[PDB]
Amino acid sequence: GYGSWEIDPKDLTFLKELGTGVVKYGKWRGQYDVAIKMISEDEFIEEAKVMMNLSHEKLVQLYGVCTKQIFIITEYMANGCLLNYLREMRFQTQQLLEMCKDVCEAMEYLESKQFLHRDLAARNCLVNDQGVVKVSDFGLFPVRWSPPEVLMYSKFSSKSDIWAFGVLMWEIYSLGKMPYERFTNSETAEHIAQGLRLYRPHLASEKVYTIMYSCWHEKADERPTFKILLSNILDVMDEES
Numbered sequence: 310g311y312g313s314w315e316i317d318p319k320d321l322t323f324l325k326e327l328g329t330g331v332v333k334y335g336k337w338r339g340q341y342d343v344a345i346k347m348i349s350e351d352e353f354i355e356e357a358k359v360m361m362n363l364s365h366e367k368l369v370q371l372y373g374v375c376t377k378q379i380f381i382i383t384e385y386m387a388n389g390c391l392l393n394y395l396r397e398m399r400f401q402t403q404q405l406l407e408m409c410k411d412v413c414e415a416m417e418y419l420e421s422k423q424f425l426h427r428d429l430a431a432r433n434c435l436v437n438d439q440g441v442v443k444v445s446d447f448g449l450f451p452v453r454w455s456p457p458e459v460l461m462y463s464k465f466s467s468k469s470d471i472w473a474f475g476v477l478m479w480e481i482y483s484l485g486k487m488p489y490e491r492f493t494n495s496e497t498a499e500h501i502a503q504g505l506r507l508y509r510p511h512l513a514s515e516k517v518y519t520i521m522y523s524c525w526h527e528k529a530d531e532r533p534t535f536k537i538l539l540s541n542i543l544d545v546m547d548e549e550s
């Protein structure tokens with residue numbers, strides 16, 4: 310059994326579909342808003358197993374599982390996917406830096422647990438009713454979010470998550486543009502190897518750009534940690550607001 314994590318499926322209500330395994334918005338005993346994912350069987354629940362051990366205010370929180378019946382239940386993020394939010398909802402630049410901080414806090418927590426996300430991007434973040442951004446899909450090819458050492462020989466590390474985070478900052482400040490918008494994946498990989506980097510979005514100040522750009526150092530060892538990035542973001546937040 311999963312102890313405290315076991316949820317009686319009969320306490321759930323189903324209110325609307327969020328996506329299609331299949332994900333629905335609902336309630337638990339009419340008390341909590343929840344998101345409910347429905348479904349191989351064994352690898353489906355591995356997501357929840359990962360989430361049982363990770364808990365943070367800026368990380369999508371597991372609420373429980375239904376395995377005797379198969380459901381995964383989490384907190385509900387009313388404003389949906391961050392990528393859609395950036396393209397569809399409406400920002401002053403200080404709200405954008407806040408979104409970056411939200412994600413940075415989640416990633417600093419993951420870093421402190423020596424856990425690698427491997428697919429950090431705006432598509433894999435969610436937004437709650439208050440506009441708080443949380444990292445999602447962490448319990449589960451993203452060429453445009455990958456450093457040269459990943460593209461060339463699958464060298465995954467804390468520093469490949471750092472690279473992806475810089476690209477996510479770029480997504481936020483560009484209001485959800487696809488990175489390297491005029492290139493294919495193949496061309497992007499080629500250009501990354503040649504030292505090409507994403508341009509500074511108009512909404513990003515030079516200080517903000519320095520932060521995202523620091524994530525893209527050719528040498529992995531020369532990229533900052535999430536702890537350093539968090540300190541940089543806070544400093545800029547204090548200086549610009």
Ligand SMILES: CCN(CC)CCOc1ccc(Nc2ncc3c(n2)N(C)C(=O)N(c2c(Cl)cccc2Cl)C3)cc1
Nearest residue numbers: 327332344345346381383384385386387389390445446
């Ligand atoms: C075009 C889309 N359209 C819908 C008609 C607009 C609205 O779309 C929305 C609206 C609200 C949400 N909110 C939302 N909250 C929590 C989770 C979640 N979505 N998804 C998709 C999961 O897989 N979760 C999750 C995870 Cl990450 C792991 C394990 C279990 C779950 Cl439920 C948790 C997401 C999308």
